[PDB]
Amino acid sequence: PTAIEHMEPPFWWAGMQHKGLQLMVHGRDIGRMEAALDYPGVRLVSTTRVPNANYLFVDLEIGPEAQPGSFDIVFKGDGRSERYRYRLLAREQGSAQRQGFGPGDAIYQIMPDRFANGDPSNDNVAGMREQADRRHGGGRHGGDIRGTIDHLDYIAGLGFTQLWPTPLVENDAAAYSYHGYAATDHYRIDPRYGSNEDFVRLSTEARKRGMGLIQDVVLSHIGKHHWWMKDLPTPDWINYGGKFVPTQHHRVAVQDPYAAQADSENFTKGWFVEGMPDLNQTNPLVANYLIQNNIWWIEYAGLSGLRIDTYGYSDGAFLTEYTRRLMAEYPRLNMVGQEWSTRVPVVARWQRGKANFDGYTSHLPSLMDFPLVDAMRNALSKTGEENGLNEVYETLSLDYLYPEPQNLVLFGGNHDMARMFSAAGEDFDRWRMNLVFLMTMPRIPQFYSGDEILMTSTVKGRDDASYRRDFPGGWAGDKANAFSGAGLTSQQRAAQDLVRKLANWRKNQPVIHNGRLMHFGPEENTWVYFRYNKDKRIMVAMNNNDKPMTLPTARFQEMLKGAPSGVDFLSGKTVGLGRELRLAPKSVVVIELPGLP
Amino acid sequence: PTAIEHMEPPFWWAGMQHKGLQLMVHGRDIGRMEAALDYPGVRLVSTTRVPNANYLFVDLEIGPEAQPGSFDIVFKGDGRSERYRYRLLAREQGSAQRQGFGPGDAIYQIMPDRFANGDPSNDNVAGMREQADRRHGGGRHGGDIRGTIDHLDYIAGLGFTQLWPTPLVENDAAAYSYHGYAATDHYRIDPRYGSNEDFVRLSTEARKRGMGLIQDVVLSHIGKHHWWMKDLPTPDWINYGGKFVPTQHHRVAVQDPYAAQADSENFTKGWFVEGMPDLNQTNPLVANYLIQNNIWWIEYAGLSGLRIDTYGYSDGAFLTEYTRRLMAEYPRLNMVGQEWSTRVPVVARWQRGKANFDGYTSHLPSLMDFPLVDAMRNALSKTGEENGLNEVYETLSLDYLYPEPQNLVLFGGNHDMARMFSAAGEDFDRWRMNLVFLMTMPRIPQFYSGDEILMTSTVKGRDDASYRRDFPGGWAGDKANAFSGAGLTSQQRAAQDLVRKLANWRKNQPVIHNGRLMHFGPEENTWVYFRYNKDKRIMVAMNNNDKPMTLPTARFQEMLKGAPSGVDFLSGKTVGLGRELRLAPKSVVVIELPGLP
Ligand SMILES: [Ca+2]
Ligand SMILES: [Ca+2]
Ligand SMILES: [Ca+2]
Ligand SMILES: [Ca+2]
């Protein structure tokens, strides 16, 4: 390592909400040196050095009077002298008040590596450990930022207003580096995807197309080949030193009156696998670093928000301060925490403004609605079940447990679970119900790339590789091409047509975004619900039986209010609502009606 | 009908908390008459008459100065005169402050008709519609109060301190009258069971044995052959006049932000079946009647509490006032509402002191813990599941949702679900885990009669008849006799021995009653939890695998705190707790340890 190998964060901005900034400087005996600076607006508060001489922490106070510009930080000591030019940048017009992703938005999820290979010459990069292999389910397939940029029109054309790629941060692992969740450098886009400047261009080109960028961020852990592991800043930088202490995933322990400390500590401090070292956020140096890094990425790349991986696995108090600091900087931003639980109360604990039994406060605006996805997936897979949708209905009834239930992210699927189409039992009619549900519910809708052309996977066992297959048309010489429509089967085309039809339609429905919901108890696996304000009503009625069903419309008259008939958006045909509602086998109708008197 | 066919309630008491009393008088043109009385302490507030001339409602105010004694109520009008002697009774010493059933208690549930036939001569009673048939699963088998009294020693000897029989109120139906849930006379014990005086004697003889009496009460509905149905007091006395409007059981509609009025009304006003007319508690006359009737039974029979059938199906506001009035009269009483939901939030809504989103208040101290029973039953039935107990653990973690979670009633089973032993897959070792769980959890334990000798039933479909088979030894000439132990198989005896061993032991464990609980996340379908105060610790460890398991005791050291070994209460053998815990295949240990420093 040189005298300054790492300066983190590499640059900052003038006029941030939180005036403070702790620089993590890394370099040969840099911690044996005094620091000084001469710049108007900036004051050097203090320096903190640790037993490891190769690190120095420098505390700056950047006042409101401080102007955009650069200055040298001079390090004296050890009979040596060092200069480092530190840059304070000017913020973009309306940076702090930026519009986060909301109920109006629709999210398209991609795995950058598995989406599109716009540049084959960055499939392998000299120095990087893992060699690219498209034939291996866990290998690097070659997808990159160039590829994603090339087809932003496909995404915007589908009707989506947000792009959430899985992490693009450097994952210099020997094995399974494609997934992005084992960071080895927090401030560098993996060169296999492109440069840092390429990531900014992704955000700006998407912005032109009328799309925001949502970064997948990991706070809880890193990769075993992170440059920290060969030169640990502090002995307590990662949890459980050198001996492998795996977590046993007891998530309720942080919100359980009967919880043992052993379970609680095991959950927040335990490693996922031997290759993912768990960060210690109770160390204030680690906490500050993570907060600053994520803010850095938002400001630098013009992100509309974040998805926070493995949310609850980070220190609860850290998460409190983390979500506070980030929402202090961007008060209208949105961040969606991944809390993998099909239980509503377990998820609800983490949302902004939730009154908890233990007095836990949070500023996390959004969470992944795993309960509602799981209930609907169960309802469609369960053949013999007489009234499977009851599970969806009852789960929705629990929304009072969330402080903001209509701000949660609902999804057709993701990279971590069975393909949407396969989860429906490879049934187009059921898949349609799932799609309509997703697009009409009082939630932020998220869609996984490939589900629009009915991609398949295994439904049981662990087979993460099968959920993450290459997007047809992403690679040069692809048989099937989902971008142009070449090589697709009639069913795949119709599925793509429908996703496009429905999502673009959803963009022009403020009644789906901000309006109210009235649902009815499912009866004989049939379900009827309404989106409504004074401007519009949307009746969604679905029949989850392979026999035709007729529902008396007298039951729904507090919503119908005399309306004689309504035009289905899907089929186009007018459906009779006067006396009885005739529903076709395994069918769904989206009926639009005038505003309620 | 005579000039006064019914005077309800038939008598009252001096010195009640609520001073008011509305008499429902029934008789030939009784409603065409003025009422008057001359008694010191009692004032006639007003009379209310309805379009049906055969009924009069008389409002009395019984002041604190009023003495025990009788007086004539004189009815003038129609050119007629009538006398009725009304009795005000003296209350028992400490009647209002009576001790309800609590965590210390243990409940034995019987179906009076299916328990013991102490008197064959009341199997049929002249006048009553349904003839007794012991051979028919839905027939009257002949069980009675005499039979229950005869074997109160068996029940107290088992270790139980409470007796909850299903309703004994007159059910004069043509079909399925044995179950008791279709009342035809609210103020009369069904003559097939005995007289009203016989029911009091049941309570007093049990009290001598150190047992309380818990009455199963139905508030929501009656039987189609209730004497009301042939002479309805008001047109709105029952819901939905003459046309059959069945309920579709959408219980969440009374606690759902997205609920339609149609679902909410359907739940509270819909009939169960064509033969069970739904009472309208929004009629103040019905509300008053039900409240007074249940209070009457408590005071009259010296009940330690109630189990409220089909709880949520009654009007929410009525239930508020109902639970208020009853708890005003008996502040230390306990009442356990049946809210059939495996979901914690749905059940929790009804408990006393629960802060609800809609501002719903309740005074119901207890509810049936269907979530925790269902989670544990799932955990034992699920063979292939790697870690099935996780469901029990996670459900327990949700107790913060209840205002008083440790006051809920947990049960091995009941008359409405598959036999406890059959639910365990006819596995004695699993049944044992279920039993220990029931007896050691921070709950009020309830046990279903027959489960102590491993009675069997079908596990799927509807077969209520199979859950309610005759108790062996209850009838003269029974092959098997569970009271004396004659004809029982080795397994049945050992099961009975264990229930007796454990329940009597539970009586002397205040640490199980009032103490704290610390559980640990189940790992590989093994589970470890602790009951603890400063006096005692109870380690319960169970292994739900047919292979032996070893658990490092270092994990549980915040509870163990150095303890080198402990004596299992079940086997008697000392189990090593120093380094590792050796658990036998499908085994459970109950280890008692000194108080925590
Ligand atoms: Ca590439
Ligand atoms: Ca962690
Ligand atoms: Ca009898
Ligand atoms: Ca009712």
Side-chain angles (χ1 to χ4, degrees), chain A residues 248 250 256 258 261-263 343 345 394 396 399 517 519 521 523 555 558, chain B residues 248 250 256 258 261-263 343 394 396 399 517 519 521 523 555 558:
Chain A
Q248 307 301 332
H250 299 121
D256 179 4
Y258 315 121
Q261 272 296 106
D263 278 349
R343 304 191 174 272
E394 284 194 28
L396 269 159
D399 279 2
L517 162 75
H519 62 188
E523 296 183 8
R555 195 194 155 190
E558 73 192 84
Chain B
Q248 307 301 332
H250 299 121
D256 179 4
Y258 315 121
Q261 272 296 106
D263 278 349
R343 304 191 174 272
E394 284 194 28
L396 269 159
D399 279 2
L517 162 75
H519 62 188
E523 296 183 8
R555 195 194 155 190
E558 73 192 84

mmCIF file of all heavy atoms in Angstrom, chain A residues 248 250 256 258 261-263 343 345 394 396 399 517 519 521 523 555 558, chain B residues 248 250 256 258 261-263 343 394 396 399 517 519 521 523 555 558:
data_model
loop_
_atom_site.group_PDB
_atom_site.id
_atom_site.type_symbol
_atom_site.label_atom_id
_atom_site.label_comp_id
_atom_site.label_asym_id
_atom_site.label_seq_id
_atom_site.Cartn_x
_atom_site.Cartn_y
_atom_site.Cartn_z
ATOM 1 N N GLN A 248 -28.328 -18.396 12.598
ATOM 2 C CA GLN A 248 -29.361 -19.417 12.459
ATOM 3 C C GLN A 248 -30.715 -18.806 12.087
ATOM 4 O O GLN A 248 -31.749 -19.467 12.181
ATOM 5 C CB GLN A 248 -29.452 -20.278 13.728
ATOM 6 C CG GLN A 248 -28.122 -20.895 14.189
ATOM 7 C CD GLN A 248 -27.462 -21.792 13.140
ATOM 8 O OE1 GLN A 248 -28.133 -22.398 12.298
ATOM 9 N NE2 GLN A 248 -26.135 -21.881 13.195
ATOM 10 N N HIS A 250 -32.876 -16.355 13.271
ATOM 11 C CA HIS A 250 -34.004 -16.224 14.195
ATOM 12 C C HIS A 250 -34.466 -14.772 14.267
ATOM 13 O O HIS A 250 -34.261 -14.085 15.273
ATOM 14 C CB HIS A 250 -33.663 -16.790 15.582
ATOM 15 C CG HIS A 250 -33.329 -18.251 15.571
ATOM 16 N ND1 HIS A 250 -32.119 -18.743 16.010
ATOM 17 C CD2 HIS A 250 -34.041 -19.325 15.154
ATOM 18 C CE1 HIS A 250 -32.104 -20.057 15.874
ATOM 19 N NE2 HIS A 250 -33.259 -20.436 15.355
ATOM 20 N N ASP A 256 -39.091 -9.836 20.227
ATOM 21 C CA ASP A 256 -39.702 -10.940 20.960
ATOM 22 C C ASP A 256 -39.501 -10.708 22.456
ATOM 23 O O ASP A 256 -38.363 -10.589 22.912
ATOM 24 C CB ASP A 256 -39.075 -12.267 20.510
ATOM 25 C CG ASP A 256 -39.629 -13.482 21.240
ATOM 26 O OD1 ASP A 256 -40.557 -13.348 22.063
ATOM 27 O OD2 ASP A 256 -39.126 -14.592 20.977
ATOM 28 N N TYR A 258 -39.918 -12.862 24.754
ATOM 29 C CA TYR A 258 -39.328 -14.072 25.335
ATOM 30 C C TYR A 258 -37.955 -14.409 24.743
ATOM 31 O O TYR A 258 -37.403 -15.480 25.003
ATOM 32 C CB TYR A 258 -40.283 -15.271 25.196
ATOM 33 C CG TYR A 258 -41.722 -14.973 25.564
ATOM 34 C CD1 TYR A 258 -42.747 -15.148 24.635
ATOM 35 C CD2 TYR A 258 -42.063 -14.525 26.843
ATOM 36 C CE1 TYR A 258 -44.072 -14.878 24.962
ATOM 37 C CE2 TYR A 258 -43.390 -14.251 27.180
ATOM 38 C CZ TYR A 258 -44.387 -14.430 26.234
ATOM 39 O OH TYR A 258 -45.697 -14.161 26.558
ATOM 40 N N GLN A 261 -30.857 -13.428 24.666
ATOM 41 C CA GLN A 261 -29.781 -12.603 24.113
ATOM 42 C C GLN A 261 -28.955 -13.351 23.068
ATOM 43 O O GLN A 261 -28.505 -12.757 22.086
ATOM 44 C CB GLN A 261 -28.882 -12.068 25.229
ATOM 45 C CG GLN A 261 -29.353 -10.744 25.816
ATOM 46 C CD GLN A 261 -29.323 -9.609 24.795
ATOM 47 O OE1 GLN A 261 -30.370 -9.175 24.302
ATOM 48 N NE2 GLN A 261 -28.119 -9.134 24.464
ATOM 49 N N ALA A 262 -28.779 -14.653 23.284
ATOM 50 C CA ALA A 262 -28.030 -15.514 22.372
ATOM 51 C C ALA A 262 -28.620 -15.517 20.964
ATOM 52 O O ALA A 262 -27.881 -15.472 19.984
ATOM 53 C CB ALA A 262 -27.950 -16.930 22.924
ATOM 54 N N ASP A 263 -29.949 -15.562 20.873
ATOM 55 C CA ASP A 263 -30.648 -15.539 19.587
ATOM 56 C C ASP A 263 -30.571 -14.173 18.921
ATOM 57 O O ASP A 263 -30.343 -14.078 17.715
ATOM 58 C CB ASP A 263 -32.110 -15.945 19.761
ATOM 59 C CG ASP A 263 -32.303 -17.447 19.811
ATOM 60 O OD1 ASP A 263 -31.349 -18.198 19.506
ATOM 61 O OD2 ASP A 263 -33.424 -17.877 20.150
ATOM 62 N N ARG A 343 -44.903 -13.259 7.735
ATOM 63 C CA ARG A 343 -45.704 -12.741 8.836
ATOM 64 C C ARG A 343 -45.736 -11.214 8.813
ATOM 65 O O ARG A 343 -44.689 -10.561 8.778
ATOM 66 C CB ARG A 343 -45.150 -13.231 10.172
ATOM 67 C CG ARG A 343 -45.050 -14.736 10.287
ATOM 68 C CD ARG A 343 -44.746 -15.142 11.717
ATOM 69 N NE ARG A 343 -44.789 -16.591 11.895
ATOM 70 C CZ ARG A 343 -45.884 -17.280 12.202
ATOM 71 N NH1 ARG A 343 -47.044 -16.656 12.369
ATOM 72 N NH2 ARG A 343 -45.819 -18.597 12.343
ATOM 73 N N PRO A 345 -46.733 -8.990 11.255
ATOM 74 C CA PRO A 345 -46.217 -8.251 12.411
ATOM 75 C C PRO A 345 -44.697 -8.150 12.417
ATOM 76 O O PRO A 345 -44.152 -7.139 12.866
ATOM 77 C CB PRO A 345 -46.687 -9.090 13.607
ATOM 78 C CG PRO A 345 -47.789 -9.930 13.084
ATOM 79 C CD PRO A 345 -47.411 -10.229 11.678
ATOM 80 N N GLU A 394 -57.374 -12.015 4.006
ATOM 81 C CA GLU A 394 -57.065 -11.886 5.428
ATOM 82 C C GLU A 394 -55.727 -11.198 5.710
ATOM 83 O O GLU A 394 -55.604 -10.459 6.688
ATOM 84 C CB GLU A 394 -57.133 -13.248 6.123
ATOM 85 C CG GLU A 394 -58.557 -13.735 6.382
ATOM 86 C CD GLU A 394 -58.622 -14.898 7.354
ATOM 87 O OE1 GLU A 394 -57.727 -15.020 8.215
ATOM 88 O OE2 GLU A 394 -59.579 -15.694 7.264
ATOM 89 N N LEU A 396 -54.353 -8.925 3.720
ATOM 90 C CA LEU A 396 -54.632 -7.521 3.418
ATOM 91 C C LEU A 396 -55.337 -6.813 4.569
ATOM 92 O O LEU A 396 -55.069 -5.637 4.836
ATOM 93 C CB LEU A 396 -55.468 -7.391 2.149
ATOM 94 C CG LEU A 396 -54.707 -7.235 0.836
ATOM 95 C CD1 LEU A 396 -55.597 -7.641 -0.321
ATOM 96 C CD2 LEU A 396 -54.191 -5.808 0.655
ATOM 97 N N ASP A 399 -53.251 -4.879 7.221
ATOM 98 C CA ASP A 399 -52.550 -3.636 6.874
ATOM 99 C C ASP A 399 -52.540 -2.548 7.957
ATOM 100 O O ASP A 399 -51.638 -1.703 7.979
ATOM 101 C CB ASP A 399 -53.082 -3.073 5.554
ATOM 102 C CG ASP A 399 -52.463 -3.750 4.341
ATOM 103 O OD1 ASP A 399 -51.652 -4.692 4.513
ATOM 104 O OD2 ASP A 399 -52.782 -3.330 3.208
ATOM 105 N N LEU A 517 -59.175 1.359 -1.155
ATOM 106 C CA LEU A 517 -59.486 -0.024 -1.493
ATOM 107 C C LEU A 517 -60.617 -0.550 -0.623
ATOM 108 O O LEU A 517 -60.603 -0.379 0.601
ATOM 109 C CB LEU A 517 -58.248 -0.922 -1.341
ATOM 110 C CG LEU A 517 -58.463 -2.441 -1.242
ATOM 111 C CD1 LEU A 517 -58.801 -3.064 -2.593
ATOM 112 C CD2 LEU A 517 -57.258 -3.133 -0.631
ATOM 113 N N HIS A 519 -62.220 -4.376 -0.423
ATOM 114 C CA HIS A 519 -62.311 -5.762 -0.873
ATOM 115 C C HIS A 519 -63.455 -6.511 -0.198
ATOM 116 O O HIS A 519 -64.017 -6.049 0.798
ATOM 117 C CB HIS A 519 -60.978 -6.518 -0.719
ATOM 118 C CG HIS A 519 -60.486 -6.641 0.692
ATOM 119 N ND1 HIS A 519 -59.238 -7.141 0.996
ATOM 120 C CD2 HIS A 519 -61.060 -6.323 1.878
ATOM 121 C CE1 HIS A 519 -59.068 -7.134 2.305
ATOM 122 N NE2 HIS A 519 -60.158 -6.640 2.864
ATOM 123 N N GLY A 521 -64.765 -10.535 1.122
ATOM 124 C CA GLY A 521 -64.323 -11.876 1.490
ATOM 125 C C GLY A 521 -64.481 -12.836 0.326
ATOM 126 O O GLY A 521 -65.557 -12.913 -0.264
ATOM 127 N N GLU A 523 -65.259 -16.066 -1.725
ATOM 128 C CA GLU A 523 -66.241 -17.125 -1.537
ATOM 129 C C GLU A 523 -66.133 -18.101 -2.698
ATOM 130 O O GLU A 523 -66.221 -17.699 -3.857
ATOM 131 C CB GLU A 523 -67.653 -16.542 -1.455
ATOM 132 C CG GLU A 523 -67.878 -15.627 -0.257
ATOM 133 C CD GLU A 523 -69.301 -15.114 -0.155
ATOM 134 O OE1 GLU A 523 -70.174 -15.572 -0.926
ATOM 135 O OE2 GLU A 523 -69.545 -14.245 0.710
ATOM 136 N N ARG A 555 -74.552 -8.109 -3.539
ATOM 137 C CA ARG A 555 -73.566 -8.147 -2.464
ATOM 138 C C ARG A 555 -72.605 -6.954 -2.491
ATOM 139 O O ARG A 555 -72.174 -6.481 -1.438
ATOM 140 C CB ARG A 555 -72.779 -9.457 -2.538
ATOM 141 C CG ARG A 555 -71.971 -9.782 -1.298
ATOM 142 C CD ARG A 555 -70.973 -10.890 -1.569
ATOM 143 N NE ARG A 555 -69.841 -10.825 -0.650
ATOM 144 C CZ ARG A 555 -68.725 -11.537 -0.770
ATOM 145 N NH1 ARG A 555 -68.575 -12.387 -1.776
ATOM 146 N NH2 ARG A 555 -67.756 -11.398 0.124
ATOM 147 N N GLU A 558 -72.663 -1.439 -2.315
ATOM 148 C CA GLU A 558 -72.092 -0.267 -1.650
ATOM 149 C C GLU A 558 -70.925 0.306 -2.457
ATOM 150 O O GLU A 558 -70.479 1.427 -2.211
ATOM 151 C CB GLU A 558 -71.671 -0.592 -0.216
ATOM 152 C CG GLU A 558 -70.423 -1.444 -0.083
ATOM 153 C CD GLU A 558 -70.234 -1.955 1.328
ATOM 154 O OE1 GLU A 558 -70.846 -2.990 1.673
ATOM 155 O OE2 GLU A 558 -69.476 -1.319 2.094
ATOM 156 N N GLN B 248 -71.135 -16.154 5.954
ATOM 157 C CA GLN B 248 -70.043 -16.730 5.176
ATOM 158 C C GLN B 248 -68.714 -16.669 5.934
ATOM 159 O O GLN B 248 -67.648 -16.863 5.349
ATOM 160 C CB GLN B 248 -69.945 -16.062 3.796
ATOM 161 C CG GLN B 248 -71.253 -16.047 2.989
ATOM 162 C CD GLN B 248 -71.829 -17.439 2.723
ATOM 163 O OE1 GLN B 248 -71.099 -18.433 2.646
ATOM 164 N NE2 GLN B 248 -73.150 -17.510 2.576
ATOM 165 N N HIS B 250 -66.730 -14.297 7.520
ATOM 166 C CA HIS B 250 -65.641 -13.371 7.203
ATOM 167 C C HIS B 250 -65.262 -12.554 8.434
ATOM 168 O O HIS B 250 -65.537 -11.353 8.513
ATOM 169 C CB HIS B 250 -65.994 -12.477 6.004
ATOM 170 C CG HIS B 250 -66.246 -13.240 4.738
ATOM 171 N ND1 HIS B 250 -67.440 -13.175 4.054
ATOM 172 C CD2 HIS B 250 -65.463 -14.099 4.044
ATOM 173 C CE1 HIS B 250 -67.378 -13.953 2.988
ATOM 174 N NE2 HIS B 250 -66.189 -14.527 2.960
ATOM 175 N N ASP B 256 -61.108 -4.676 9.834
ATOM 176 C CA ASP B 256 -60.461 -4.564 8.531
ATOM 177 C C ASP B 256 -60.722 -3.168 7.970
ATOM 178 O O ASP B 256 -61.878 -2.777 7.807
ATOM 179 C CB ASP B 256 -60.999 -5.654 7.593
ATOM 180 C CG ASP B 256 -60.402 -5.604 6.194
ATOM 181 O OD1 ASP B 256 -59.509 -4.775 5.924
ATOM 182 O OD2 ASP B 256 -60.834 -6.416 5.353
ATOM 183 N N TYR B 258 -60.259 -2.245 4.966
ATOM 184 C CA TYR B 258 -60.800 -2.384 3.610
ATOM 185 C C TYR B 258 -62.133 -3.140 3.574
ATOM 186 O O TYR B 258 -62.632 -3.484 2.501
ATOM 187 C CB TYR B 258 -59.776 -3.053 2.675
ATOM 188 C CG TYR B 258 -58.368 -2.506 2.793
ATOM 189 C CD1 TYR B 258 -57.306 -3.340 3.143
ATOM 190 C CD2 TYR B 258 -58.092 -1.159 2.545
ATOM 191 C CE1 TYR B 258 -56.009 -2.849 3.253
ATOM 192 C CE2 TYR B 258 -56.795 -0.657 2.654
ATOM 193 C CZ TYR B 258 -55.760 -1.509 3.008
ATOM 194 O OH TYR B 258 -54.477 -1.021 3.118
ATOM 195 N N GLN B 261 -69.268 -3.105 4.235
ATOM 196 C CA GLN B 261 -70.369 -3.227 5.191
ATOM 197 C C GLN B 261 -71.119 -4.550 5.046
ATOM 198 O O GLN B 261 -71.571 -5.124 6.040
ATOM 199 C CB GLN B 261 -71.332 -2.045 5.061
ATOM 200 C CG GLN B 261 -70.954 -0.847 5.923
ATOM 201 C CD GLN B 261 -71.014 -1.160 7.416
ATOM 202 O OE1 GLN B 261 -69.977 -1.309 8.073
ATOM 203 N NE2 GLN B 261 -72.230 -1.273 7.955
ATOM 204 N N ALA B 262 -71.231 -5.027 3.808
ATOM 205 C CA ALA B 262 -71.901 -6.288 3.502
ATOM 206 C C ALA B 262 -71.268 -7.472 4.229
ATOM 207 O O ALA B 262 -71.977 -8.336 4.738
ATOM 208 C CB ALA B 262 -71.920 -6.528 1.999
ATOM 209 N N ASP B 263 -69.936 -7.500 4.277
ATOM 210 C CA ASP B 263 -69.199 -8.559 4.968
ATOM 211 C C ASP B 263 -69.330 -8.452 6.480
ATOM 212 O O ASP B 263 -69.525 -9.457 7.163
ATOM 213 C CB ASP B 263 -67.722 -8.532 4.576
ATOM 214 C CG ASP B 263 -67.449 -9.233 3.261
ATOM 215 O OD1 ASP B 263 -68.350 -9.927 2.737
ATOM 216 O OD2 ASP B 263 -66.317 -9.095 2.755
ATOM 217 N N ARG B 343 -54.723 -16.855 13.365
ATOM 218 C CA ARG B 343 -53.987 -15.600 13.282
ATOM 219 C C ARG B 343 -54.039 -14.851 14.612
ATOM 220 O O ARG B 343 -55.119 -14.611 15.161
ATOM 221 C CB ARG B 343 -54.555 -14.724 12.168
ATOM 222 C CG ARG B 343 -54.575 -15.386 10.808
ATOM 223 C CD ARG B 343 -54.902 -14.373 9.727
ATOM 224 N NE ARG B 343 -54.785 -14.945 8.387
ATOM 225 C CZ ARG B 343 -53.663 -14.966 7.674
ATOM 226 N NH1 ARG B 343 -52.545 -14.444 8.165
ATOM 227 N NH2 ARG B 343 -53.660 -15.509 6.464
ATOM 228 N N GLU B 394 -42.228 -18.759 16.715
ATOM 229 C CA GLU B 394 -42.589 -17.484 16.099
ATOM 230 C C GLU B 394 -43.971 -16.969 16.508
ATOM 231 O O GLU B 394 -44.165 -15.761 16.649
ATOM 232 C CB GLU B 394 -42.467 -17.565 14.575
ATOM 233 C CG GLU B 394 -41.028 -17.507 14.070
ATOM 234 C CD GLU B 394 -40.929 -17.250 12.578
ATOM 235 O OE1 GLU B 394 -41.843 -16.617 12.009
ATOM 236 O OE2 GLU B 394 -39.928 -17.675 11.966
ATOM 237 N N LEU B 396 -45.404 -17.621 19.430
ATOM 238 C CA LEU B 396 -45.193 -17.160 20.802
ATOM 239 C C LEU B 396 -44.566 -15.773 20.855
ATOM 240 O O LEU B 396 -44.906 -14.966 21.726
ATOM 241 C CB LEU B 396 -44.326 -18.144 21.581
ATOM 242 C CG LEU B 396 -45.052 -19.241 22.353
ATOM 243 C CD1 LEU B 396 -44.105 -20.394 22.614
ATOM 244 C CD2 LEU B 396 -45.640 -18.708 23.660
ATOM 245 N N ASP B 399 -46.839 -12.628 21.120
ATOM 246 C CA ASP B 399 -47.595 -12.341 22.346
ATOM 247 C C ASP B 399 -47.700 -10.861 22.738
ATOM 248 O O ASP B 399 -48.647 -10.468 23.428
ATOM 249 C CB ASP B 399 -47.053 -13.168 23.514
ATOM 250 C CG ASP B 399 -47.595 -14.590 23.522
ATOM 251 O OD1 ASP B 399 -48.358 -14.959 22.596
ATOM 252 O OD2 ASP B 399 -47.264 -15.338 24.466
ATOM 253 N N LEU B 517 -41.005 -16.395 30.915
ATOM 254 C CA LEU B 517 -40.608 -17.364 29.902
ATOM 255 C C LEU B 517 -39.478 -16.815 29.045
ATOM 256 O O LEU B 517 -39.540 -15.674 28.575
ATOM 257 C CB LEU B 517 -41.798 -17.753 29.011
ATOM 258 C CG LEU B 517 -41.503 -18.418 27.657
ATOM 259 C CD1 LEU B 517 -41.088 -19.878 27.812
ATOM 260 C CD2 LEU B 517 -42.686 -18.305 26.714
ATOM 261 N N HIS B 519 -37.673 -18.477 25.694
ATOM 262 C CA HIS B 519 -37.491 -19.556 24.727
ATOM 263 C C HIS B 519 -36.330 -19.287 23.777
ATOM 264 O O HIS B 519 -35.826 -18.164 23.691
ATOM 265 C CB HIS B 519 -38.785 -19.876 23.956
ATOM 266 C CG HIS B 519 -39.313 -18.747 23.122
ATOM 267 N ND1 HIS B 519 -40.541 -18.806 22.498
ATOM 268 C CD2 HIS B 519 -38.795 -17.533 22.816
ATOM 269 C CE1 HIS B 519 -40.752 -17.682 21.839
ATOM 270 N NE2 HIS B 519 -39.710 -16.891 22.017
ATOM 271 N N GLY B 521 -34.842 -20.096 19.680
ATOM 272 C CA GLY B 521 -35.221 -20.477 18.324
ATOM 273 C C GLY B 521 -34.974 -21.955 18.088
ATOM 274 O O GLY B 521 -33.876 -22.444 18.353
ATOM 275 N N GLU B 523 -33.954 -25.304 16.360
ATOM 276 C CA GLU B 523 -32.922 -25.620 15.382
ATOM 277 C C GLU B 523 -32.939 -27.118 15.122
ATOM 278 O O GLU B 523 -32.836 -27.911 16.057
ATOM 279 C CB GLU B 523 -31.547 -25.178 15.889
ATOM 280 C CG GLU B 523 -31.411 -23.673 16.081
ATOM 281 C CD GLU B 523 -30.022 -23.248 16.517
ATOM 282 O OE1 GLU B 523 -29.101 -24.096 16.539
ATOM 283 O OE2 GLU B 523 -29.853 -22.052 16.838
ATOM 284 N N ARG B 555 -25.061 -22.359 24.435
ATOM 285 C CA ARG B 555 -26.077 -21.506 23.829
ATOM 286 C C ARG B 555 -27.102 -20.983 24.841
ATOM 287 O O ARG B 555 -27.590 -19.860 24.705
ATOM 288 C CB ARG B 555 -26.788 -22.271 22.711
ATOM 289 C CG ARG B 555 -27.615 -21.409 21.779
ATOM 290 C CD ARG B 555 -28.541 -22.255 20.928
ATOM 291 N NE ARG B 555 -29.703 -21.491 20.485
ATOM 292 C CZ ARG B 555 -30.774 -22.014 19.896
ATOM 293 N NH1 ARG B 555 -30.845 -23.318 19.665
ATOM 294 N NH2 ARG B 555 -31.778 -21.226 19.534
ATOM 295 N N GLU B 558 -27.354 -18.058 29.513
ATOM 296 C CA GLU B 558 -28.010 -16.926 30.171
ATOM 297 C C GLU B 558 -29.180 -17.399 31.036
ATOM 298 O O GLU B 558 -29.694 -16.649 31.865
ATOM 299 C CB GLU B 558 -28.456 -15.875 29.155
ATOM 300 C CG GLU B 558 -29.659 -16.257 28.312
ATOM 301 C CD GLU B 558 -29.864 -15.307 27.154
ATOM 302 O OE1 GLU B 558 -29.207 -15.495 26.106
ATOM 303 O OE2 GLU B 558 -30.680 -14.368 27.292
#
